[PDB]
Every structure is written in C-alpha cells, then in structure tokens.
Amino acid sequence: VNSFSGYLKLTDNVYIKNADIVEEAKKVKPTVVVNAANVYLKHGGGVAGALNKATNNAMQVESDDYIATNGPLKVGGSCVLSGHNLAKHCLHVVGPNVNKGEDIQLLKSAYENFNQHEVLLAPLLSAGIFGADPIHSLRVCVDTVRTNVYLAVFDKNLYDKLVSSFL
Ligand SMILES: O=C(c1cnc2[nH]c(=O)[nH]c(=O)c2c1)N1CCCCCC1
Numbered sequence: 062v063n064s065f066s067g068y069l070k071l072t073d074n075v076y077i078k079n080a081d082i083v084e085e086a087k088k089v090k091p092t093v094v095v096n097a098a099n100v101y102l103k104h105g106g107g108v109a110g111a112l113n114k115a116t117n118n119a120m121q122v123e124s125d126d127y128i129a130t131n132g133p134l135k136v137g138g139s140c141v142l143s144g145h146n147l148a149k150h151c152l153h154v155v156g157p158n159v160n161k162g163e164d165i166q167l168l169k170s171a172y173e174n175f176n177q178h179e180v181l182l183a184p185l186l187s188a189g190i191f192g193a194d195p196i197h198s199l200r201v202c203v204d205t206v207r208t209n210v211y212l213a214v215f216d217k218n219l220y221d222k223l224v225s226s227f228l
Contacts, residue, residue, distance in 0.1 A: 063180060064089050065211045071227060074209050075202060079220040082108060082184055082213040083115045086147035091211075094144055095175070095183035096120075097191065098153035100133040102140075107190040116145040124153070136163050137170030152178060159192030168198065172205040180209045189215075199223055 068076035078085075086094045097108040102124035104113035113120040123142055134140060139154040156171040157163030171186050185202065187193035195214075202210065214220040 063209075065091075065182075068211055069224065072203055074207060075212065076210065077199075077212045077214060077220070077223065079215075079217045080213040081111075081215055082182065083111050083147070085182060085213050086112075086144070087115070089182060091144075091148045091180065091182040093150050093152050093178045093181040094148035095181055095186075096151050096153045097184050097186060097189065098134070098139075098155050099158065100136060100138075100155050102128055102134070102153060108184045112147065112151070115147060119143075119145050120151065137167040139171075139174035148182070152181065152183075154183075154186060156187035156191055156193070156198075159187070160190070165193060165197075168193065168201050169205050172202055175206045175210055176208055178208055180211070182211045182213060184213055184215075195219055196223060196226055199227065 068078045071077055096112050104110055104121050134155050136155050136157055139152055141150050141152055144151045154171050154174050157165055157167040168187050175181055185195050185198040188195040188198050
C-alpha cells in the first residue's frame with residue numbers, strides 16, 4: 062500500500078491521473094519523482110521548468126554542479142539527484158526531443174531507467190514540448206516499465222484522450 066490516490070489503473074503496474082506533477086509531488090512526497098530533463102539539465106520549461114520553479118531554483122543549482130562535474134547526459138539516459146521539497150530523489154530522464162530531430166526509438170531506452178526504482182511518480186517522457194505523441198509514449202511506457210509507475214498528466218483533455226484510446 063502506498064499514498065497515491067485517485068489514479069486509474071491501466072495495467073498490473075501502470076497508473077494514470079490528471080494532475081499537476083508539482084502539486085502531486087508536494088502532497089505525496091514520493092520516493093522518486095521523474096523529471097523530463099534535457100542532456101544539459103537546463104530546466105527552462107515544460108515539466109522541468111515547473112518542477113525547478115517549485116524548488117525555488119535549487120534543482121537548477123544542483124544540476125549545474127552535476128553537469129560541471131560529469132558533463133551532459135545521453136539522450137535516453139538519466140541521473141539521480143535530490144528531490145528537494147518535492148520528493149526524496151528526482152530521477153532526471155532524457156527522452157528524445159522530436160523538435161531537435163532525436164531518434165524516437167531512444168524513448169524505450171529512456172523508460173528503461175524507470176526499472177531501477179520500485180515506485181515512481183512521472184510524466185509521459187518526450188510528451189509536451191519534447192514533441193512526441195503522448196499516446197505512443199504511453200504505449201512504450203506500458204511495454205517497457207515493469208516497476209510501479211504513477212503517471213501525472215497535466216492536461217485534462219489529453220488525459221481523457223489517452224484513457225479512451227488505451228488498449
Ligand atoms: O508548466 C506548468 C506551470 C508552471 N508554472 C506555473 N505558474 C503559475 O503562476 N501558474 C501556472 O499555471 C503554472 C503552470 N504546469 C505544467 C507542468 C507541471 C504541471 C503543473 C503546471
């Protein structure tokens with residue numbers, strides 16, 4: 062038993078809700094919140110910008126130190142950093158950005174990072190400003206992630222669509 066409420070169960074291990082991931086992290090305080098990161102951990106907009114602003118820019122400060130030490134992530138890769146006031150840890154995961162021409166097949170590799178964590182609160186990778194089809198992203202999620210994932214979808218219209226079209 063865990064503290065996630067209001068979710069619709071999609072599969073044995075995938076749950077979905079219409080929620081603001083920032084507000085959901087603020088109330089659940091999950092062990093892991095997933096950020097829709099880029100390779101530079103520049104948290105300027107989208108989920109990333111929203112999560113970072115909720116940390117009063119502390120996420121960005123930590124991220125800049127990480128990059129200064131380690132260099133950029135790979136597309137399809139991830140790193141574990143602090144969750145600040147939102148979660149214990151933030152898993153920064155880089156899905157391919159279709160608006161940069163990145164290969165969509167890397168979306169499966171991105172979701173594989175979730176399997177290193179027993180439970181996660183997450184957005185749909187490569188959705189929103191990353192330009193991928195959120196329905197395809199949901200299919201890859203279901204077919205790749207084996208651990209327990211609670212998907213927060215900000216847009217109510219999108220949500221209702223994802224549910225109605227789910228197989
Ligand atoms: O990007 C935002 C977001 C960020 N900052 C905001 N600041 C404000 O004053 N009003 C807003 O609606 C607002 C929205 N979201 C999408 C990704 C996370 C889910 C919640 C909202």
